[PDB]
Design a protein around this ligand. Structure first.
Ligand SMILES: *[C@@H]1O[C@H](CO)[C@@H](O[C@@H]2O[C@H](CO)[C@@H](O)[C@H](O)[C@H]2NC(C)=O)[C@H](O)[C@H]1NC(C)=O
Ligand SMILES: *[C@@H]1O[C@H](CO)[C@@H](O)[C@H](O)[C@H]1NC(C)=O
Lengths: 89, 275, 150, 365, 50, 62
């Protein structure tokens, strides 16, 4: 989350009602009574659920890395051909 | 199942080895002859397939390194096939149907999992007395069913999602027909009983004979005559069996080999031998 | 100002011989701000007390720099007396309970502000006036790792 | 009982026993009746209840001898005359009884009871928790429909190939190669056998993939929950967990005779072995689930070698009660004892007396 | 180990009857929009992984 | 109701302690010589069985 703030109760500026319900709200959170109220109206079926359908290997991401290492090894034979023949003649 | 020969690799890398065998194929008949063209063609096209078709070994004392590592490339590709296929088959979860009546599916009935009861029954009143289950009733009151037999047929035909009803009748339903499952255990206990008008003369005698029959054992022993368990249980503890669909595609390629051979042998040999 | 030593928020380091704590540069070569701290005995478990100037820098100290810059302040920093944050407990053989630790030195009158990781709850809200929260968090358990055998 | 008191052969080297243990007389009539039998042997008693008895003598200067109960276990008012430990109090064969005596209303009428000193409940214990797979046959990964088609459609390339090669290769030799290549051991002969070898690799790797799917999404039985579980309230079953032990003439025998007769009818398979000899049946395999009080069960759950898991525990309880020492009718010793437990409730010796006889020693990982 | 089983926050503290009460509570909110509190997170509580 | 705390609102109208936290978020769609060569072949088969099993489990990671 970005620029984290919170909900609130907007009341008239410099009122005498502020201190009374300010402590009442802090009483609610500091006792877990808001947890029971929170789990009745904010609940989803797949909250604790995650399963990708697939990551089908029909895509060159890791087999491509294998493919080009074969080309690297393929060039070793050509280099060996010159070294083996020249050193033996 | 879906696309046996095409699910894991039917894309850029599927035709990679199709041409990655051709690049090495010609590159060997020109590595040995230049200090047989079919020999390298059949060899690499066979060693990748681990076939018992023996042919010419790499004649060059230097060419033996690529072949001994070409097998390793063939050794690694098919392994990645096996692991990838298993992952797709595992993540095909059939069903996680329901818990008891506390699931978030129950509480929020947008469209999925509509549940209906028999109208004017005891259950339909109990859901109007509980204060917590207000939304649950508010969705059930929109539509319901008239008879218990109607709900069983609709659920079996998959026209109604879930059915809430008495347990004694429902337990006999699943055990006998065996297309149905009871979702856990009961969440509300109650009982049956005869009903008579208030201040009726027989209100004491009929109640007495019920108590006598329980200790006697007649009532308990009668249940077996009309209630039983048979022919169906918790089986099907195997969440897969390869169908006759993906293997058919596997059976498809072998058929193509048959048609390729007979058509080519009959036609090409006639032209080649005549000339 | 009253402050407490907490690992990621307020660091405490001994000063150099010249009095000023040695400078250092971050990963991007920018000057990290530091302020001079008085306060603790430099010997918590092995001596009664004796104060000594030290050096501080961290999260809260960085915010205090930006906070006081707008407010046109003039600030001094001194650490807490006995480490503890604060609680209500009846003192030995008395009538009523009185506040402890860091909260005590502010309610008594030794300081006018607490810039430290102080939580928000009902008991402290009776006698102190908080501000809007500047970080959200919870409570979690720390355990030792399990060996991935071989 | 197992945890609350323990009786043993005292000490083969001294006649008496190791100290902090009291000798007790026991009568076992397991012999004939020709002349007579004297089974009163000097054993010794060690356990929690002896500590309480040894802690009240030091308070009210009590003096005593210890005698066992001549028969199985506790009793209830049956057939008009009781049978068991209570009878020894009613029939003037003794004065008081000490030990795991659960308080109740069916027995408080004919004998008084004091304040309890524990917080016990009734729970269900089941056999050990085991993790085992369930593959019936290695041919499971395909349905038998695929096998026969796989077997037969493999036989057609056996015949077709030799027809396209005979027009050399022996007729008998050709069938051997076909089986051999699909088991990975060994333009007229090459074209079909090439993709035919591919036929082996393409599906043989899927067998590995399928078996990798069988051994992941499978699971064991759920170690069924407390009383209201689906396996119990349906007592019409011959191969469920088939045990409702509920030791004969026990205190919990009356509780399952309260309202519903569906349970007492199938609870007739009880075994008269008081606790332990019938308890090992749950570990042996001839007994599936045994019902008793949670006090002597959790200690048996932990202190016993290996793992044998009780139900949920402090939450899986029904009709929580307590054990107390009974005061016989027309005996005003209640004031003397009631002070003792209450005094033992105050000083905090309940924990010290517990940790020396009841604890969790080696919990299962 | 696992998630968190309680939720709370931090905050500056000042005595009752304070003139700076109204003003500092504005700077704390004002810095949250400018992303100032975000980079302070990126400075020395993050970017220090193993 | 669903009212958020920010700079401008707090200037002209007072506020209470936040009881539900929120912010700004982004959402998008989803002989002895040959005895050794026998050992090497023994290591090769186990190494692959280890490899494919290792990748398969890594592949099962949502
Ligand atoms: C909080 O900040 C405001 C804005 O800077 C301060 O309001 C100013 O106060 C000075 C002090 O006399 C006045 O000269 C300015 O005219 C005020 N600004 C405006 C726009 O009128 C306010 O004083 C600060 N709070 C405290 C307690 O000092
Ligand atoms: C800040 O306070 C000083 C007094 O030390 C005063 O001279 C100055 O005008 C005030 N304002 C600014 C913006 O510096």
């Amino acid at each position: 989350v970005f620029a984290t703030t919170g909900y609130g109760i907007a009341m008239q500026k410099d009122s005498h009602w502020k201190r009374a319900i300010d402590l009442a709200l802090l009483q609610f959170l500091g006792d877990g009574e808001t947890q029971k109220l929170e789990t009745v109206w904010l609940s989803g079926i797949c909250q604790n659920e995650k399963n990708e359908v697939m990551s089908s290997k029909l895509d060159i991401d890791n087999m491509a890395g294998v493919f080009y290492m074969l080309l690297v090894a393929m060039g070793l034979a050509l280099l060996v051909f010159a070294w083996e023949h020249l050193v033996y003649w | 199942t879906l696309d046996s020969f095409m699910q894991p690799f039917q894309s850029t890398l599927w035709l990679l080895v199709g041409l990655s065998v051709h690049v090495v194929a010609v590159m060997l008949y020109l590595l040995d002859r230049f200090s047989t063209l079919s020999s390298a063609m059949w060899f690499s096209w066979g060693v990748l397939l681990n076939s018992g078709i023996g042919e010419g070994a790499p004649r060059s004392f230097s060419a033996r390194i690529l072949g001994m590592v070409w097998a390793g490339f063939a050794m690694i590709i098919v392994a990645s096939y096996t692991a990838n296929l298993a992952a797709f088959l595992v993540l095909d979860r059939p069903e996680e149907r329901i818990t008891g009546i506390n699931d978030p599916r129950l509480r929020n009935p947008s469209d999925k999992f509509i549940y209906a009861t028999v109208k004017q029954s005891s259950v339909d009143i109990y859901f109007r007395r509980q204060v917590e289950l207000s939304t649950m009733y508010r969705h059930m009151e929109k539509h319901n069913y008239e008879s218990a037999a109607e709900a069983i047929q609709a659920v079996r035909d998959n026209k109604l999602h879930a059915f809430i009803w008495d347990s004694a009748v429902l337990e006999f339903e699943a055990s006998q027909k065996c297309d149905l499952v009871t979702t856990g255990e009961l969440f509300f206990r109650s009982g049956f009983g005869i009903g008579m008008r208030k201040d009726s003369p027989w209100k004491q005698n009929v109640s007495l004979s019920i108590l006598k029959s329980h200790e006697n054992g007649f009532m308990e022993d009668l249940d077996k005559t009309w209630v039983r368990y048979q022919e169906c249980d918790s089986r099907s503890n195997a969440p897969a069996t390869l169908t006759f669909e993906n293997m058919a595609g596997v059976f498809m390629l072998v058929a193509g080999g048959i048609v390729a051979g007979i058509f080519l042998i009959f036609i090409e040999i006639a032209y080649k031998r005549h000339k | 100002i009253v402050t407490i030593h907490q690992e990621p928020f307020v660091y405490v380091k001994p000063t150099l011989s010249d009095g000023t704590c040695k400078e250092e540069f971050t990963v991007n070569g920018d000057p990290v701000k530091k302020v001079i701290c008085t306060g603790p005995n430099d010997t918590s478990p092995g001596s009664p007390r004796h104060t000594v100037p030290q050096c501080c820098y961290g999260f809260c100290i960085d915010l205090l720099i930006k906070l006081a810059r707008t407010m046109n302040f003039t600030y001094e920093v001194h650490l807490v007396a006995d480490g503890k944050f604060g609680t209500q407990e009846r003192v030995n053989n008395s009538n009523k309970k009185e506040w402890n630790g860091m909260m005590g030195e502010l309610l008594s009158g030794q300081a006018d502000m607490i810039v430290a990781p102080l939580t928000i709850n009902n008991e402290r809200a009776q006698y102190i006036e908080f501000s809007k929260p500047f970080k959200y968090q919870g409570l979690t358990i720390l355990v030792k790792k399990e060996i991935p055998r071989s | 009982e197992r945890p609350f008191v323990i009786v043993e052969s005292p000490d083969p080297g001294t006649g008496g026993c190791v100290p902090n243990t009291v000798p007790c007389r026991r009568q076992s009539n397991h012999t004939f009746s020709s002349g007579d039998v004297a089974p009163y042997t000097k054993l010794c008693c060690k356990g929690f209840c002896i500590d309480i008895l040894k802690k009240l003598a030091r308070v009210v200067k009590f003096s005593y001898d210890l005698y066992l109960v001549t028969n199985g276990k506790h009793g209830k008012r049956v057939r008009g005359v009781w049978n068991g430990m209570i009878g020894e109090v009613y029939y003037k064969r003794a004065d008081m009884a000490i030990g795991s005596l659960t308080i109740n209303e069916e027995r408080s009428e004919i004998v008084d009871f004091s304040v309890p000193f524990v917080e016990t409940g009734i729970s269900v214990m089941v056999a050990r928790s085991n993790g085992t797979v369930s593959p019936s046959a290695f041919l499971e990964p395909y349905s038998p429909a695929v096998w026969v088609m796989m077997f037969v459609m493999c036989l057609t390339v056996v015949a077709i190939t030799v027809f396209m090669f005979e027009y050399a290769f022996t007729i008998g030799k050709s069938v051997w190669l076909l089986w051999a290549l699909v088991f990975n051991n060994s333009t007229t002969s090459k074209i079909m056998v090439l993709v035919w070898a591919f036929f082996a690799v393409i599906f043989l790797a899927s067998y590995t993939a399928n078996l990798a799917a069988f051994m992941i999404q499978e699971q064991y039985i759920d170690t069924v929950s407390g009383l209201s579980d689906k396996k119990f309230q349906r007592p019409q079953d011959q191969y469920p967990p088939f045990r409702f032990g509920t030791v004969p003439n026990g205190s919990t025998e009356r509780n399952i005779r309260s309202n519903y007769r569906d349970m007492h009818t199938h609870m007739v398979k009880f075994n008269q072995r008081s606790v332990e000899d019938a308890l090992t049946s749950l570990k042996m395999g001839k007994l599936d689930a045994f019902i008793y009080d949670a006090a002597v069960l959790n200690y048996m759950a932990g202190k016993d070698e290996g793992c044998k898991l009780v139900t949920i525990g402090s939450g899986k309880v029904f009709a929580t009660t307590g054990y107390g020492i009974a005061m016989q009718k027309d005996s005003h010793w209640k004031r003397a004892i009631d002070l003792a437990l209450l005094q033992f409730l105050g000083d905090g010796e309940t924990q010290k007396l517990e940790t020396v006889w009841l604890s969790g020693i080696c919990q299962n990982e």
